[PDB]
Write a protein that binds this ligand. Structure first.
Ligand SMILES: Cc1noc(C)c1S(=O)(=O)N[C@H](C)c1ccc(-c2cc(F)cnc2Cl)cc1
Length: 250
């Protein structure tokens, strides 16, 4: 049967979020980018609500919670995109929302084809490894807890206990399907290395994000309130590597 913390993680998963995109008019760079940022804002709000329901998280210092959301939102948003894309369109379109779906031809015709390809790796990776919903749920929690400040957190001990608990739960998620010691330990190496590898992909999204933010008036791409806050709060510091990426393997 499904381990209860994994069953809890499924009950608190954010519900479907609509981008609000007018599909009756042709695509332009600004309309698409604006819709994606608006979707971004709504998804960020749902990450915050999710984190308040996420066992352990509310028990960290309030400054730590904020910092970890500010550090990880981009990883969580693209991991989420990867999963929706995998689950609804077999990983072969980018499923940002039910009303905002980009097949490859729509990607090609956008003003950000390369960004689309970069983001598209993630669902292609889920397809390859046949990632379970239970694995996915646990790995997503680990992304929230995957970077800390160079000086550490105010609630460092509590944080380590929480992170260690979800690592243990990921191992149980793996145990549901992969029977055998050698297959399960190799599976744990694969999934955790995928998380290590995300840091690089995310860094490219962070740079693109910062460049777009700087240039937002020229591009006609608005950045809503909470998104503007998390970018201004931490993004240069993150790009600079003035944080501590947690790694599973050297
Ligand atoms: C890239 C990127 N990621 O987040 C933000 C914000 C950016 S950005 O380049 O500053 N803005 C553009 C419009 C943008 C591009 C992609 C996404 C985005 C990315 C993602 F992986 C899952 N969902 C969404 Cl809505 C959200 C916004």
């Amino acid at each position: 049967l499904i381990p209860p913390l994994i069953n809890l993680l499924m009950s608190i998963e954010p519900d479907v979020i609509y981008a609000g995109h007018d599909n009756t008019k042709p695509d332009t760079s600004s309309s698409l980018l604006t819709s994606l940022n608006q979707l971004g804002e709504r998804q960020l709000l749902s990450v915050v609500k999710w984190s308040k329901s996420l066992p352990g998280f509310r028990n960290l210092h309030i400054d730590d919670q904020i910092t970890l959301i500010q550090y990880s939102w981009m990883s969580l948003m693209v991991f989420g995109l990867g999963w929706r894309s995998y689950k609804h369109v077999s990983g072969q379109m980018l499923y940002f929302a039910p009303d905002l779906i980009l097949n490859e031809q729509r990607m090609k015709e956008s003003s950000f084809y390369s960004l689309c390809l970069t983001m598209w790796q993630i669902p292609q990776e889920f397809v390859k490894l046949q990632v379970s919903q239970e694995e996915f749920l646990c790995m997503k929690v680990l992304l929230l807890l995957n970077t800390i400040p160079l000086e550490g957190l105010r609630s460092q001990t509590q944080f380590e206990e929480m992170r260690s608990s979800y690592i243990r739960e990921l191992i149980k998620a793996i145990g549901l399907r992969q029977k055998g010691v050698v297959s399960s330990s190799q599976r744990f190496y694969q999934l955790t290395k995928l998380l290590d590898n995300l840091h690089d992909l995310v860094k490219q999204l962070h740079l693109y994000c910062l460049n777009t933010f700087i240039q937002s008036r020229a591009l006609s791409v608005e950045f809503p309130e909470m998104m503007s806050e998390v970018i201004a709060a931490q993004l240069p510091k993150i790009l600079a590597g003035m944080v501590k990426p947690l790694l599973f393997h050297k």
